[PDB]
Design a protein around this motif. Structure first.
Motif, PDB file in Angstrom:
ATOM      1  N   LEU A 191     127.276 -22.472   9.280  1.00  0.00           N
ATOM      2  CA  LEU A 191     127.263 -22.919   7.894  1.00  0.00           C
ATOM      3  C   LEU A 191     126.838 -24.413   7.761  1.00  0.00           C
ATOM      4  N   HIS A 208     118.977 -26.005   3.638  1.00  0.00           N
ATOM      5  CA  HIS A 208     119.330 -26.428   2.263  1.00  0.00           C
ATOM      6  C   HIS A 208     120.119 -27.695   2.423  1.00  0.00           C
ATOM      7  N   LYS A 241     119.543 -26.805  -6.445  1.00  0.00           N
ATOM      8  CA  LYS A 241     119.554 -26.420  -5.041  1.00  0.00           C
ATOM      9  C   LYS A 241     119.131 -24.964  -4.758  1.00  0.00           C
ATOM     10  N   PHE A 242     119.213 -24.140  -5.796  1.00  0.00           N
ATOM     11  CA  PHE A 242     119.042 -22.670  -5.724  1.00  0.00           C
ATOM     12  C   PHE A 242     117.662 -22.285  -6.322  1.00  0.00           C
ATOM     13  N   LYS A 270     116.044 -19.580  -6.184  1.00  0.00           N
ATOM     14  CA  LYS A 270     115.883 -18.256  -6.820  1.00  0.00           C
ATOM     15  C   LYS A 270     116.152 -18.254  -8.342  1.00  0.00           C
ATOM     16  N   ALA A 299     132.021 -15.863   2.832  1.00  0.00           N
ATOM     17  CA  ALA A 299     132.038 -16.779   3.971  1.00  0.00           C
ATOM     18  C   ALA A 299     133.272 -17.730   3.930  1.00  0.00           C
ATOM     19  N   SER A 309     123.023 -24.603   8.423  1.00  0.00           N
ATOM     20  CA  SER A 309     122.066 -24.325   7.312  1.00  0.00           C
ATOM     21  C   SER A 309     122.176 -25.262   6.133  1.00  0.00           C
ATOM     22  N   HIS A 310     123.383 -25.784   5.850  1.00  0.00           N
ATOM     23  CA  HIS A 310     123.589 -26.702   4.739  1.00  0.00           C
ATOM     24  C   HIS A 310     123.156 -28.123   5.064  1.00  0.00           C
ATOM     25  N   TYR A 349     128.623 -32.222  -3.448  1.00  0.00           N
ATOM     26  CA  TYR A 349     128.472 -30.916  -4.074  1.00  0.00           C
ATOM     27  C   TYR A 349     129.472 -29.923  -3.538  1.00  0.00           C
TER      28      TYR A 349
END
Ligand code: HEM
Ligand code: NA
Length: 153
Positions: free
Chosen positions: A89, A97, A42-43, A45, A71, A92-93, A103
């Motif tokens: 939150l 993303h 999921k990440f 970066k 958060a 965005s989830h 998860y």
């Protein structure tokens, strides 16, 4: 919801987290990615990382874990009255993303594990049951928002 006593115990152990938030963010995310490697995908970066030593060395990971725990502390401090905090939150989830509710269940379990590990004195049985309920409430309310947003989490 939770009782006043349950919230107080949630907020007590959270003060331990906040006394070193980056340290805690790193261990929760490492516990998550090691127990459930699909979550790391999921990440973007740092999804390329393979070992716990790489994870510990990663500034990006440490940074994201601090943002996540910060958060969550915000939400928790509202003791249930977290509509304003949960709104962006969930948004965005469910869009930017797409984070399955499963998860969120894995990272909740990672938090609980890390807390039991690092703070046994502030995290005995009662305290653990109370953090359990607080994170269940968080995931349930995020799920309700996911539905509205068109994301089957
Ligand atoms: C305790 C539960 C969580 C909390 C409070 C939380 C909170 C946040 C916050 C505040 C941000 C940055 C701002 C935003 O986009 O809204 C963020 C970003 C992010 N989160 Fe979550 N999160 C949680 C769980 C998860 C899980 C379980 C995953 C994936 C398995 C995840 C994936 C992401 C990703 C991919 C980003 C973007 C990170 C980046 O900048 O590279 N989150 N989260
Ligand atoms: Na109440």
């Amino acid at each position: 919801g939770l009782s006043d006593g349950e919230w107080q115990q949630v907020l007590n152990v959270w003060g331990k987290v906040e006394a070193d938030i980056a340290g805690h963010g790193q261990e929760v995310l490492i516990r998550l990615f090691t127990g459930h490697p699909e979550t790391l995908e999921k990440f973007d970066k740092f999804k390329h990382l393979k070992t716990e030593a790489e994870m510990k060395a990663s500034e990006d990971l440490k940074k994201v874990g601090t943002v996540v725990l910060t958060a969550l502390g915000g939400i928790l401090k509202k003791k249930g009255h977290h509509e304003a905090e949960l709104k962006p939150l969930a948004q965005s989830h469910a869009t930017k993303h797409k984070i399955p509710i499963k998860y969120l269940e894995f990272i909740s379990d990672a938090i609980i594990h890390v807390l039991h590990s690092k703070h046994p004195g502030d995290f005995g049985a009662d305290a653990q049951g109370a953090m359990t309920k607080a994170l269940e409430l968080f995931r349930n309310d995020i799920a309700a928002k996911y539905k509205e947003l068109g994301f089957q989490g």
